[PDB]
């Protein structure tokens, strides 16, 4: 599909394709649309009865559908 | 100042104040306005000539002012 907002595909001097995130000013080799990466310290992944992933934060002792690695909901 | 968007301060049955993030559906004891917490694996913090923190991602081999722990820019 389309790149997510703020991202651009570029080509370097040698003709290699890479990706730029203008929201953070990073560049990276992998397409951000593709898609190990560990969860941050103190977190675990579990699955609901329906097989939907969710995230357990043992630091704060809370849970969320939002993957802390990506900011994306497991429900979307 | 004000709570950040999506957050609410609540009181529990015992009268203890806690914080709710309706964007992620977590709750937590700490005020989100206050604000260990390690950087994620493969990251380091450095400082510019001006003493401004920035973040080095050795996984992707890139750098950013945006703290991966918070999504907030070191420049804001």
């Amino acid at each position: 599909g389309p790149l997510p907002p703020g991202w651009e595909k570029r080509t370097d001097s040698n003709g290699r394709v890479y990706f730029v995130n203008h929201n953070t000013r990073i560049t990276q080799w992998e397409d951000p649309r593709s898609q190990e990466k560990p969860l941050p310290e103190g977190w675990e992944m579990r699955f609901t009865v329906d097989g939907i992933p969710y995230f357990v934060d043992h630091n704060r002792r809370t849970t969320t559908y939002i993957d802390p690695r990506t900011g994306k909901s497991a429900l979307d | 100042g004000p709570l950040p968007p999506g957050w609410e301060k609540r009181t529990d049955s015992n009268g203890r104040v806690y914080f709710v993030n309706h964007n992620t559906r977590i709750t937590q004891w700490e005020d989100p306005r206050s604000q260990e917490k390690p950087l994620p694996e493969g990251w380091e913090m450095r400082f510019t000539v001006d003493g401004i923190p920035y973040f080095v991602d050795h996984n992707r081999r890139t750098t950013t002012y945006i703290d991966p722990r918070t999504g907030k820019s070191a420049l804001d």
Binding site: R10, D12, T27 | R61
Partner: peptide
């Protein structure tokens, strides 16, 4: 041999 991606400022 790993290679870093191009610098934001060199590129942009």
């Amino acid at each position: 041999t790993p290679e870093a991606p191009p610098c934001y400022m060199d590129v942009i």
